[PDB]
Amino acid sequence: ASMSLKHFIQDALSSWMKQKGPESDIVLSSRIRLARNFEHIRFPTRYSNEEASSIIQQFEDQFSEQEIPGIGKFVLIRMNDAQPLEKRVLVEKHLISPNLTESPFGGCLLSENEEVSVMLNEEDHIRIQCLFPGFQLLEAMKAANQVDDWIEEKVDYAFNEQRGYLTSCPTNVGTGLRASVMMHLPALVLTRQINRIIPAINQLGLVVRGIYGEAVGNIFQISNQITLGKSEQDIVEDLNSVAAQLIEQERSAREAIYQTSKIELEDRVYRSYGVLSNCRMIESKETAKCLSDVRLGIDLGIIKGLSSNILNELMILTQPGFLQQYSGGALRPNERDIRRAALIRERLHLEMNGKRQEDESI
């Protein structure tokens, strides 16, 4: 574990991702992803070990320890220098894909603030990821373009004038651009409306998946599925428009259940807080259920004195990889449920004692 690997696996929620983005009650994050390949180098499907090593080596040489103004310094993490639990944490923080952990010459060039993650030797040689809190696809696209320009200064992209950027996936040819949004939709699930919505979203060339990428914790990721022939601007508007609708529909449904079944909803969310604050065993499944309830309670003003950032942190912190990393070494499922309960209840008791004791001074 290098000092920079420790830096990226240490915190479940980066300071970058703790910032308040627009519509952050419904949209947790926005992701922009640009795929490219080296000109004259065979796509990862048919390239040699030597080729893959050169891609990583060229990045360590020209981009490691280098900087972009306004984004910060970039550090290169090689998958081969990371223990299995270290790699899982990077997955659970949404910094790398699961498939990157299986790539023998996989690596990722990460900005120190964790806003930019350039995956190397995944499905394409280069996958630039920009991750913003809340709803900011245009802002994420700008950062993506800065990193893209930065890399193209020293890398010649597989490009042709009639097809655009050449990618391994034939559908991906063109912009290499994929946009996804992470959304918390507890009211649309609760009111039994989401299963009549998802089929409509899939009609618009988008795809809906759970947090992993079933929808535990009522968290849904909506991303571009069809991009062949679309411009960058069309790709981002196709997702933006659907997300903005979902923001409105999820808000209306929250206001609806709050107005019609106020006490039942308070009972639901405080009972879930009750579980999190007193349980001695809890699985990931139930944790996700309860965290969703409490987050809905916070958003509606029912659950008081608890910030949403604590909940975002626990959603990552209670994942099985991160929980084992944080506890030091692998753990049986039963042991995890005991450690998870202790971590959640202690983190929660801590947040209500700060809120008790700093509020008391005033």
Spatial distance between the Cα atoms of 9 and 87, rounded to a whole number of angstroms: 9
List the chain gaps (C–N > 2.5 A) by preceding residue.
213
Q: Are 97 and 69 in contact (CB under 8 A)?
A: no
**DSSP string covering 295-313:** HHHHHTT-S-S--HHHHHH
The piece of 99-107, 183-191, 255-263, 285-293 that touches a copy of itself (CB under 8 A) is: 255-263
Report the residue number, 46 or 192, with the smaller CB distance to a copy of itself.
192
Shortest distance, CB of residue 264 to a copy of itself, whole angstroms?
9
Residue 268 tokens, joined: 């639901």
Shortest distance, CB of residue 266 to a copy of itself, whole angstroms?
14
Ligand-binding annotation for 179, yes or no, is yes
Shortest distance, CB of residue 261 to a copy of itself, whole angstroms?
6
Does 259 sit near a copy of itself (CB under 8 A)? yes
Spatial distance between the Cα atoms of 41 and 353, rounded to a whole number of angstroms: 57
Q: How many CA atoms lie within 13 A of 339 on its CB side?
A: 20
Question: What does 148 bind: a copy of itself, Mg ion, none (CB cut-off 5 to 8 Å by kind)?
Answer: Mg ion
36 φ, ψ to 5°?
A: -145, 165
Does 122 sit near Mg ion (CB under 5 A)? no
| Amino acid identity at 11 | D
Shortest distance, CB of residue 149 to Mg ion, whole angstroms?
6
| Amino acid identity at 228 | L
Using CB under 5 A as the binding criterion, the count of chain residues that bind Mg ion stands at 1
Ligand-binding annotation for 281, yes or no, is no
Report the residue number, 62 or 261, with the smaller CB distance to a copy of itself.
261
Does 195 sit near a copy of itself (CB under 8 A)? no
Among residues 115, 124, 148, 299, the one that binds Mg ion under rule CB under 5 A: 148
Does 261 sit near a copy of itself (CB under 8 A)? yes
Among residues 15, 49, 203, 260, the one that binds a copy of itself under rule CB under 8 A: 260
107 φ, ψ to 5°?
A: -155, 170
Question: What does 48 bind: Mg ion, a copy of itself, none (CB cut-off 5 to 8 Å by kind)?
Answer: none
The piece of 15-23, 129-137, 256-264, 305-313 that touches a copy of itself (CB under 8 A) is: 256-264
Q: Are 185 and 295 in contact (CB under 8 A)?
A: no
Spatial distance between the Cα atoms of 276 and 284, rounded to a whole number of angstroms: 12
Rule CB under 8 A: which residues touch a copy of itself? 259-261
